[PDB]
Write a protein that binds this ligand. Structure first.
Ligand code: ADP
Ligand code: BEF
Lengths: 29, 259, 131
């Protein structure tokens, strides 16, 4: 039952990492 | 690297091993950033590398510094902190560990000091510290309030100001060994003693040691005479300081010509 | 040539003139954003259309690595020395292999004379204090 919340947790984490990478590559110019 | 470069890196490593914190005063163009990058590279025991590197540089030097990291070593990762409240907040949330080095301006560090307080910092370098000369400023106190075992500087063209500057610099280098301003003032003889005191935890190169092929720049003065209108205004004036220098530099400021 | 000034009003008059005559006009003052700064600084290496560049001492001279230029012109004087020095070196660094020449447009001893005398005395002090 708690597996769905854990997987949602790491998919939120990777979405946040993608957003941070997008901000960085915007910042890289 | 370079000879002088490697020697300064070795000196910094020796000071770190001894736990001493000092400045790195060299002329502009000698490779301060390169020397700092080499010193960061020298850390291999996985002590400072594991933690972050707070590089508090001036705003203008954010991009060049950034590029210098993105090109000198393909290992160090940068996590810039300067921009719109949104982006900066997101970046702060990110590490809240690949946060190797951080780039931030002076004002951004003081304003957002609370964000930096909750994060532990392995190493801190505040480039271009020539601004940190007034201890009465909030910048000085905010920088002092950080809890970091080792402080390193790469500020160039040091001092040249009043003794206040010197007090601030030295008291920042170490809270101990320095108690009161007037005390420092009390401490040919004076100059020699000051040079002896500052000899161990300081370096210097100048331009002759490091410039092997650099044409000596030629400085030319050029007096310019004031015009008719300028003279009429200078006469009026004679018959403050800002207004004065303005009226001199050009009259349009006080009297844009009419139609 | 790299022109350095202090007053934004002055800079604006200079802009007006550089638009009257066609020498091109590229500036990066303190009011300019950091991204625009970084942009112009990327352009001014690996780009040659910009004939002249317009800076201010604190905003541009410190830490901008402008080796491309061969000459530096100081339109105005600074009370505290070691501030035109930053600019001077920023053009006279390691990549400036062409030439170095630093002019100094001052007045004929009107009020500038006191500033230049104070600057020379302070430079002599800072020169001998630790070297
Ligand atoms: N080993 C090196 N190889 C190539 N360029 C170097 C090297 N070391 C330093 N530089 C040059 O030094 C400049 C940066 O120096 P900088 O850190 O601004 O000097 P300062 O700290 O005295 O202002 C860069 O333009 C870079 O080309
Ligand atoms: F001269 Be360095 F870019 F501060």
């Amino acid at each position: 039952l708690t597996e769905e919340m854990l997987l949602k947790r790491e998919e939120r984490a990777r979405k946040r990492r993608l957003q941070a990478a997008r901000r960085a590559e915007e910042h890289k110019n | 690297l370079k000879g002088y470069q490697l020697k300064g890196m070795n000196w910094l490593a020796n000071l770190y091993e001894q736990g001493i914190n000092g400045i790195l005063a060299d002329e502009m163009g000698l490779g301060k950033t390169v020397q700092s990058i080499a010193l960061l590279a020298h850390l291999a025991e996985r002590e400072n590398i594991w933690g972050p590197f707070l590089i508090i540089s001036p705003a203008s030097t954010l991009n060049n510094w950034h590029q210098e990291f993105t090109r000198f070593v393909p290992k160090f990762k940068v996590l810039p902190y300067w921009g719109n409240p949104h982006d900066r907040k997101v970046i702060r949330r990110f590490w809240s560990a690949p946060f190797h080095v951080v780039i931030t301006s002076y004002q951004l560090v003081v304003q957002d000091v609370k964000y930096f307080q909750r994060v532990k910092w392995q190493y801190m370098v505040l480039d271009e510290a020539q601004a940190l000369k007034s201890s009465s400023s909030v910048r000085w106190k905010i920088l002092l309030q950080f809890q970091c075992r080792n402080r390193l500087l790469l500020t160039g063209t040091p001092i040249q100001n009043t003794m206040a500057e010197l007090w601030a610099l030295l008291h920042f280098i170490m809270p101990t060994l320095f108690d009161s301003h007037e005390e420092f003032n009390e401490w040919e003889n004076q100059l020699s003693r000051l040079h002896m005191i500052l000899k161990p935890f300081m370096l210097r190169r100048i331009k002759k040691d490091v410039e092997n092929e650099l044409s000596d720049k030629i400085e030319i003065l050029m007096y310019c005479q004031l015009t008719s209108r300028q003279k009429l205004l200078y006469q009026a004036l004679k018959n403050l300081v800002m207004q004065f220098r303005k009226v001199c530099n050009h009259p349009e400021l006080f009297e844009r010509q009419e139609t | 040539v790299l022109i350095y000034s202090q007053m934004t009003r002055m800079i604006d008059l200079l802009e007006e003139y550089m638009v009257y005559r066609k020498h091109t006009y590229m500036r990066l003052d303190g009011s300019s954003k950091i991204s625009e700064r970084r942009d112009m600084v990327a352009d001014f290496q690996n780009r040659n259309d910009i004939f002249v560049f317009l800076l201010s001492t604190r905003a541009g001279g410190l830490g901008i690595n402008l080796t491309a230029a061969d000459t530096v012109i100081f339109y105005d004087s600074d009370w505290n020395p070691t501030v035109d020095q930053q600019a001077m070196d920023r053009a006279h660094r390691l990549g400036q292999t062409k030439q170095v020449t630093v002019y100094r447009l001052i007045c004929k001893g009107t009020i500038e004379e006191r500033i230049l005398q104070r600057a020379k005395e302070k430079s002599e002090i800072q020169r001998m204090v630790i070297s």
